[PDB]
């Protein structure tokens, strides 16, 4: 039986799996007030991917396809193509495309294109409303509203790369983007097949471990906050070791190797998710060499150490 | 610790060079210029060279605070480390980690923060890394954007890479180049503590090259970009730090589907592939393809002519 | 765990210069962030500079080119070099240092005045 084991990639060295920025802290908190079920970053211990999760850590809220439009209009409508250019399904057992952005808010980016012929290319500023009724990554069509109303042709490769997220400075700050909130894959009245389930700490006095991000703002005042259950890191590497889990929960100890002590320890439970022994909101100031070691399998009423 | 590769398909994995996925590999001459990336170098055993860092998506990637001359568009951007720490240019590098390593145009956008409110703003930028003011290695970048007085002092600013420009009135494809090595210092310095340039020493072999396409954002520009190693290898080998036992690791690339051996390779010590092959010619491989190390040869094995 | 003790504030003219210095007492050993607070009159307390055990630092914009930090190889003192004073830094100064990932000390807090 294949030994299980997590990468010793320092935090500030990986990628949180739902935008394509790296990693910067370390966050628990409650999560009852919330759902929390992300489609992105989501895999079991023996490397089964969920939801939408692939193994691409920058192709996560990026889009291609060919654009066409009413004309005069600078809203474009995406046919979506696979990551590889070639023809997506929409019959795969799956919530949307692999990569889709799992949080309800404007997305804004870039557009380019290039003409096959001469090669000729062009890019313009592009934004995503990922709650709007028309967005529908799962039925293959996505709109971007860009600053061009005849720049863009039709039958072309085109691709958005994600920048970050944007408000409306008039209305409530950090009312924007919702993270917790899953879109609408195939429209504002269909409903979503496929999900990767809800996570939330069962165990008396745990909470989640988030692995967090600060998106960054475009215009206005946006919640940048983007916590992720697992580092895309980990998602590679799981799916690569499948590694057999010996039981429900893998026990972690946070290692600082500047002095071999050990930091705080959680549980990596096999279904892909961190939880740690605390109560209340908190960032964890860690140092910059510091990495998780897989210790032990234990199982779910094992009681952690009070800290993390 | 035995020795691996990742089991992770080309199209499964990143470019080294510029936050983009891989498309296909890519054989060819390599004799008309000089092959000395400093992104995406990094030796089996683990040891990172040049401007090679860990993180995939900061890769030419830069965070500081903005300055700007009044009326003017360029604004400087004195660097900070990845992590929003000072700069210490004391290191043994060439530049910071993840600095673009071509002369070109880099067009992305850069964001800004004001810590105070938390109100946020981002504009089109673009970074000319051939430019004399382009000096890195000193702490300092200079980017040309679309607004003259947005940006505020003292503020956390980031610059996001989106692709690359030329000027659509030159010759097409003539820029960017991705074998030109910027100067890392300004206009007139030299380069320090650079990874060693790459070529193809056995007799009828060439260079293995991981290929993507950069995204173009104005004119005709090359947007082929090659990198020597995939960024899930250099975040592989630094992880399992297993020793070379020789000088070239046999890798053989299969399809998982059929058993087909479809190509033979050498994984060189210092961080390189090359295949037995002549000419430039596209690899087209099944989707679920990949490399799988074999052994430890000798560098006189001679490679099944393939690929 | 472990204690600190601000030392080395007072009066100054603009302009001038102080040197603060914390003294660490216990498992400094534990020690892998030592840094410098303030509060100035009317505002919380903010952050002015930091340092890690390999010697990673980080000063804030209001400060950087004016205030330096440093530590002790043994992280038993670090110190803040402070000059071109201005009487925006006018305030009490804390020192800090994290022990744990929810674990750190605070000292007492000297006051430092910058005024004719």
């Known amino acids: 039986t294949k030994p299980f084991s997590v990468p010793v990639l320092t935090v500030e060295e990986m990628t949180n799996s739902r935008f394509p920025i790296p990693l910067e802290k370390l966050f628990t908190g409650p999560s009852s007030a919330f759902v929390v079920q992300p489609q992105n970053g989501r895999c079991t211990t023996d490397g089964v991917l969920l939801g939408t999760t692939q193994l691409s850590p920058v192709n996560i809220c990026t889009f291609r396809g060919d654009v066409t439009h009413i004309t005069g209009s600078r809203n474009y409508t995406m046919n979506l193509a696979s990551q590889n250019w070639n023809d997506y399904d929409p019959t795969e057992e799956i919530p949307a495309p692999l990569g889709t952005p799992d949080f309800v808010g404007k997305i804004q980016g870039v557009l380019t294109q290039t003409t096959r012929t001469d090669g000729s290319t062009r890019g313009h500023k592009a934004t995503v409303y990922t709650g709007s009724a028309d967005f529908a990554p799962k039925l293959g069509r996505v709109q971007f509203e860009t600053d061009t109303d005849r720049d863009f042709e039709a039958n072309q490769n085109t691709k958005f790369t994600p920048v970050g997220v944007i408000q409306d400075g008039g209305t409530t700050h950090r009312n924007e983007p919702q993270q917790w909130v899953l879109p609408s894959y195939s429209g504002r009245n269909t409903h979503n097949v496929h999900l990767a389930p809800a996570v939330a700490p069962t165990f008396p006095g745990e909470q989640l471990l988030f692995f967090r991000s600060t998106m960054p703002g475009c215009s206005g005042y946006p919640n940048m906050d983007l916590d992720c259950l697992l580092p895309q890191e980990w998602v590679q590497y799981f799916y690569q070791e499948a590694a057999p889990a010996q039981s429900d929960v893998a026990l972690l100890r946070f290692v600082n190797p500047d002095t071999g002590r050990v930091l705080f320890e959680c549980k990596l439970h096999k279904s892909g998710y961190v939880t740690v022994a605390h109560t209340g909101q908190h960032d964890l100031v860690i140092p910059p060499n510091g990495y998780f070691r897989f210790d032990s399998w234990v199982n779910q009423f094992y009681t952690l150490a009070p800290m993390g | 610790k035995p020795f691996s590769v990742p089991v992770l398909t080309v199209e499964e994995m990143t470019n080294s060079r510029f936050p983009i996925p891989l498309e296909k590999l890519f054989t060819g001459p390599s004799s008309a210029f000089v092959v000395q990336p400093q992104n995406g170098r990094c030796t089996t055993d683990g040891v990172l060279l040049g401007t090679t860092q860990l993180s995939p998506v900061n890769i030419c990637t830069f965070r500081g605070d903005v300055t700007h001359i009044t009326g003017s568009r360029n604004y400087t951007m004195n660097l900070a480390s990845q992590n929003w720490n000072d700069y210490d240019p004391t290191e043994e590098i060439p530049a910071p980690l993840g600095t673009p390593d071509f002369v070109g145009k880099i067009q992305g956008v850069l964001t800004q923060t004001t810590r105070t409110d938390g109100s946020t703003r981002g504009h089109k930028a673009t970074v000319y890394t051939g430019s004399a003011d382009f000096a890195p290695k000193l702490g300092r970048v200079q980017f040309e954007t679309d607004t003259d007085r947005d940006f505020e002092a003292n503020q956390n600013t980031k610059f996001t890479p989106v692709g690359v420009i030329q000027d659509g009135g030159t010759t097409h494809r003539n820029e960017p180049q991705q074998w030109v090595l910027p100067s890392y210092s300004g206009r007139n310095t030299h380069n320090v503590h650079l990874a060693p340039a790459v070529a193809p020493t056995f007799p009828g072999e060439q260079l293995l090259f991981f290929r993507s396409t950069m995204p173009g954002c104005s004119g005709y520009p090359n947007m082929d970009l090659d990198c020597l190693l995939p960024q899930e290898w250099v975040q592989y080998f630094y992880q399992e730090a297993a020793p070379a036992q020789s000088d070239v690791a046999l890798l053989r690339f299969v399809n998982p589907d059929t058993g087909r051996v479809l190509f033979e390779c050498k994984l060189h010590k210092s961080g390189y592939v090359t295949v037995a092959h002549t000419g430039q010619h596209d690899l087209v491989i099944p989707p679920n393809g990949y490399f799988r190390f074999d052994s430890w040869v000798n560098q006189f094995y001679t490679l099944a002519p393939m690929g | 765990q472990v204690q600190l003790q601000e030392s080395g504030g007072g009066l100054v003219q603009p302009g001038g210069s102080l040197r603060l210095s914390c003294a660490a007492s216990?498992?400094?050993?534990?020690?892998?962030?030592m840094g410098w607070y303030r509060q100035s009159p009317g505002k919380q307390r903010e952050l002015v500079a930091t340092?890690?055990?390999?010697?990673?630092?980080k000063h804030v914009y209001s400060v950087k080119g004016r205030f330096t930090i440093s530590r002790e190889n043994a992280k038993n003192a670090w110190y803040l070099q402070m000059n071109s004073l201005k009487p925006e830094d006018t305030g009490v100064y804390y020192c800090?240092?994290?022990?744990?990932?929810?674990?750190?000390?605070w000292g007492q807090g000297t006051q430092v005045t910058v005024s004719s």
């Open positions: 216990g498992d400094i050993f534990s020690i892998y962030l």
């Open positions: 340092i890690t055990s390999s010697g990673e630092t």
């Open positions: 800090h240092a994290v022990t744990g990932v929810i674990a750190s000390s």
